[PDB]
């Protein structure tokens, strides 16, 4: 079929078909353009007119312009020949290395795995990060979420996980940049290459990349995650492999939708969001999942507007995760990186039956004391510390040292911390905290515990500080 | 051209024309009325219809009524014969003294002076008010703004300034009462007569008065500023005169705009204000300015709704001033007048290369100590001063003495302070504040500093307090 | 002991007063956020 453009208002384009109305979700191509412009059908307005979202700029479009129904939703090159490559929302290479010669093509829109397809294996996935591991362990094949307001560490944390995990991972990895910084896709691509995760000469590439950055129109941003996720589902089902999925930042998918929502003629829900936020998020989040066929280990960065965790978006996403790392500008502000909030981070495997009681009693032991100290903070603030029971001024001590022992110099932030990155093993972590909690270092100074890897470095640093 | 009234809603009158549709901004005269009713065209709705804003109450109008294109925008008598006269939005005298017989007439809608026409001379304007002079000094030909929630001191401060500055000013003055109290216009007029700035006998008046008060329909309040403004522009450019322009209150012009905006059929912006708030403030604020031809020192009172300075109206006004005097209810309630917030008032002249470093260092000195006192306040609040450091308690002493020394009796507020108004010379201010800072009066009691002019009077008060 | 008694009487009474004020400030704020958030929804809906 051939339709005509009847109205253009931003990323929203209305098309009128004379015969044969393209179904909802169908992709249409605008005729007469130097570059490929795809319009996704969004609604049937009636009168053989469809309302659509543009996958790119709408400049220069004209009323009356021709549009052909492609007869199917956006379909992209899926398969192993996507590895080491950089793709578009619409599946076009954007790395200047030629076509992507895949055997098959997949539509980015698809139903989520059925209930009888779910898996319930729960294996801790050690990362080398003290805080995460100790208190909110990630799980292989589980859904992980890094929550944070602007500039608190979401991406760097995603960066050190790619290093401490993606790099040894025997399986593919798909990194989908959704509405983030272009500078960043260029930093990562070239880093993947310099470290051979991406190989431009041979077929040893172990990571496919998909990008729809912040310089794109809402439409592209409302779909890249789909493209990204679609690439990943292939390796899960058609190959049955262990996939690692990185998305930075999934909030962008939801902001994308809120940006065209009004032009779609909808009464706004609260906080400006579109009324279909949760369902829009649901049909998507439900595909990002491990099944009996394959396994996905998704690490999704989640932006928090105005730093408010109750904002309908961040708020609506918690339910889709098995582990959550909540970052806080209040912690970051103190120079404690990674700025994870020890009392607002959780993992579904923080179970004695899964990580063990030593792991579990330490974690909870560390959390009680930080909570105990949080409560006193506001009070010794004013009433001072003298009146406090030696019993209580020891927890202030230990807490302040733990607070530090939880920071760590990342290997991807030496440009930031001026410190060599340290990766600590799960047992070095459990033990280090166990001892602080045990009173075994009440003599060393707090500062000795700040920006160090394993507990021995805290002891060494004490001496170095000893003068 | 003759059009017909098609619709009437409050101050928004829609008129249809058959031949010859008047351009936007043109003033139309409604036909068949005991008094003049000017309609200002606002937009072409198409279908030969124009949507307009009435300049007076619209009661009595009838659909189908005849309207006549005046052929131009509201035009008003401009020249020296407006001096000593009180006039309307539409320029008619309202002082029962006859017609204002002028050679020329000016239209209230003009474009703002061009970039190349701008000036950059920065001269300090001393007012005799301690806080203002020391911390946020005004400037000749500059733009000053006094921000204040209800009943905080905006008008009293304008009056005291009229007294301290306007009274001995060689050159003219224009007072534009926008959306304020009628009694105030009356209080001022008669006072102006009395001190002789308005002379009903000779041609020696130095003030022209324009008013569109709290009792007018929205459209009048929405345009009187433009009207006072135009009068001032004449003296500036047509006589290269150094003008003084007082407006009470410019917030009312914006409010007026918000009143008609729904009627014009516009989707509201934040807080129910009109989406055209900034541009409306802009093309208006940009004519209130000094140029190469003439100087306009303008003092504008800015009413802050619910005391919220984040309100679109006041919020959008900061960017147009060179100096701002932000009044505070909290301070006023402490009994400090003028209730100026010392850490919130500013002035583009607070530059060492303009006020001198002596001035620049006392100024920043005072603010630093008050800022320091300000952070201690939270703790002082639950636990008082006991737990304070000897050092911290000295900032507190000094801060509370600096805070009191910033207050001062105005002639204009004598009936309320119970004290004789004082005018302190700049060097007296720079000085008195130095010493306080410098610990030369750590022995005097706070109360000695409250409500006085020069420091010398603060020492005395201390003796009297014994 | 008479000065600590006095100082702690005051401190405690200041606290309570502070408590009473923050609480009232809390409710004013709580009511305005709801009202504010609701007018925002209505404005968007009416514009359509």
């Amino acid at each position: 079929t051939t339709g005509r453009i009847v109205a253009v208002i931003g990323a929203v384009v209305d098309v009128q078909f004379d015969e044969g109305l393209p179904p909802i979700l169908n992709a249409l191509e605008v005729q007469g353009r130097e570059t490929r412009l795809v319009l996704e059908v969004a609604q049937h307005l009636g009168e053989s007119t469809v309302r659509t979202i543009a996958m790119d700029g709408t400049e220069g479009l004209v009323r009356g312009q021709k549009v052909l129904d492609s007869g199917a939703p956006i379909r992209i090159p899926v398969g192993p020949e996507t590895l080491g490559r950089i793709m578009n929302v619409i599946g076009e290479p954007i790395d200047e290395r030629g076509p992507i010669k895949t055997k098959q093509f997949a539509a980015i829109h698809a139903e989520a795995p059925e209930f009888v397809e779910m898996s319930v294996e729960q294996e801790i996935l050690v990362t080398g990060i003290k805080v995460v591991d100790l208190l909110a362990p990630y799980a292989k094949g589980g859904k992980i979420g890094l929550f944070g307001g602007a500039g608190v560490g979401k991406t760097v944390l995603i960066m050190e996980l790619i290093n401490n995990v993606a790099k040894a991972h025997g399986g593919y990895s798909v990194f989908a940049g959704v509405g983030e910084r272009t500078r960043e896709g260029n930093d990562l691509y070239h880093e993947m290459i310099e470290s051979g995760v991406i190989n431009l000469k041979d077929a040893t590439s172990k990571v496919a990349l998909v990008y729809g950055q912040m310089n794109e129109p809402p439409g592209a941003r409302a779909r890249v995650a789909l493209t990204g996720l679609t690439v990943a589902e292939y390796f899960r089902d058609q190959e049955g492999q262990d996939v690692l999925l990185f998305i930075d930042n999934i909030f962008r998918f939801t902001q994308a939708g809120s940006e065209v929502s009004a032009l779609l003629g909808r009464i706004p829900s609260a906080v400006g969001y579109q009324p279909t936020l949760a369902t829009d998020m649901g049909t998507m989040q439900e595909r990002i999942t491990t099944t009996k066929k394959g396994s996905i280990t998704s690490v999704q960065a989640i932006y928090v507007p105005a730093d408010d965790l109750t904002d309908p978006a961040p708020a609506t996403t918690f339910a889709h995760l098995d582990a959550t790392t909540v970052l806080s500008r209040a912690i970051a502000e103190l120079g404690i990186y990674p700025a994870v909030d020890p009392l607002d981070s959780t993992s579904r495997i923080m179970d004695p039956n899964i990580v063990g009681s030593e792991h579990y009693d330490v974690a909870r032991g560390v959390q009680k004391i930080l909570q105990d100290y949080k409560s006193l903070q506001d009070i010794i603030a004013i009433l001072g510390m003298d009146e406090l029971s030696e019993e209580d001024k020891l927890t202030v001590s230990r807490a302040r040292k733990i607070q530090r022992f939880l920071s760590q110099p990342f290997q991807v932030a030496e440009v930031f911390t001026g410190h060599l990155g340290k990766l600590v093993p799960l047992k070095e972590t459990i033990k280090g905290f166990q001892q602080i909690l045990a009173g075994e270092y009440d003599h060393l100074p707090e500062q000795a515990f700040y920006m160090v890897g394993p507990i021995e470095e805290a002891v060494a640093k004490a001496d170095k500080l000893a003068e | 051209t003759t059009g017909r009234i098609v619709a009437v809603i409050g101050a928004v009158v829609d008129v249809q024309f058959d031949e010859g549709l008047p351009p936007i901004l043109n003033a139309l005269e409604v036909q068949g009325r005991e008094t003049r009713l000017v309609l200002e065209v606002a937009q072409h709705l198409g279908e030969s219809t124009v949507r307009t804003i009435a300049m007076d109450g619209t009661e009595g109008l009838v659909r189908g009524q005849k309207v006549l294109d005046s052929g131009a925008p509201i035009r008003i008598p401009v020249g020296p014969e407006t001096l000593g006269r009180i006039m309307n939005v539409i320029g008619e005298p309202i002082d029962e003294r006859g017609p204002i017989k002028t050679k020329q007439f000016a239209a209230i809608h003009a474009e703002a002076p061009e970039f190349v026409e701008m000036s950059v001379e920065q001269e300090i304007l001393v007012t005799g008010i301690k806080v203002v002079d020391l911390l946020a000094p005004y400037a000749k030909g500059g733009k000053i703004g006094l921000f204040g929630g209800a009943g905080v001191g905006k008008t009293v401060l304008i009056m005291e300034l009229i007294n301290n500055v306007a009274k001995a000013h060689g050159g003219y003055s224009v007072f534009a009462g926008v959306g304020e109290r009628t009694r105030e216009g009356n209080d001022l007029y008669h006072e102006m007569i009395e001190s002789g700035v308005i002379n009903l006998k000779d041609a020696t008046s130095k003030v022209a008065l324009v008013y569109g008060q709290m009792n007018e329909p929205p459209g009048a309040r929405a345009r009187v500023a433009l009207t006072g403004l135009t009068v001032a522009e004449y003296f500036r450019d047509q006589e290269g005169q150094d003008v003084l322009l007082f407006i009470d209150n410019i917030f009312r012009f914006t409010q007026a705009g918000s009143e008609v905006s729904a009627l014009l059929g516009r989707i509201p912006s934040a807080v129910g204000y009109q989406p055209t708030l900034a541009t409306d403030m802009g093309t208006m604020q940009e004519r209130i300015t000094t140029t190469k031809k003439g100087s306009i020192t303008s003092v504008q009172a800015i009413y802050v709704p619910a005391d919220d300075l984040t309100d679109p109206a006041p919020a959008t006004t900061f960017a147009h001033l060179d100096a701002t005097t932000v009044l505070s209810r909290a301070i006023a309630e402490l009994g400090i007048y003028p209730a100026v917030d010392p850490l919130d008032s500013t002035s583009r002249i607070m530059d060492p290369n303009i006020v001198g470093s002596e001035h620049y260092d006392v100024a920043r000195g005072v603010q630093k100590i008050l800022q320091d006192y300000k952070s201690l306040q939270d703790i002082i609040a639950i636990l008082g001063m006991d737990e304070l450091s000897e050092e911290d308690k000295l900032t507190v002493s000094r801060a509370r003495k600096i805070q009191r020394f910033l207050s001062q009796p105005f002639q204009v507020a004598e009936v309320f302070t119970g004290h004789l108004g004082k005018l302190v010379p700049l060097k007296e201010t720079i000085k008195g504040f130095q010493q306080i800072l410098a610990g030369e009066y750590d022995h005097l009691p706070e109360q000695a500093f409250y409500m006085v002019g020069p420091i010398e009077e603060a020492v005395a008060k201390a003796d009297k307090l014994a | 002991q008479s000065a600590r008694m006095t100082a702690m009487d005051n401190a405690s009474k200041n606290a309570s007063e502070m408590i009473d004020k923050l609480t009232l400030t809390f409710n004013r704020t709580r009511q305005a956020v709801i009202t504010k958030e609701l007018i925002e929804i209505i404005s968007g809906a009416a514009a359509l």
Binding site: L383 | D386, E390 | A3, R4, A7
Partner: peptide, 12 residues
């Protein structure tokens, strides 16, 4: 501490 100016007085 927390007894007003008991100590500061003697110290002074």
């Amino acid at each position: 501490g927390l007894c007003g100016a008991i100590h500061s007085s003697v110290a002074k």
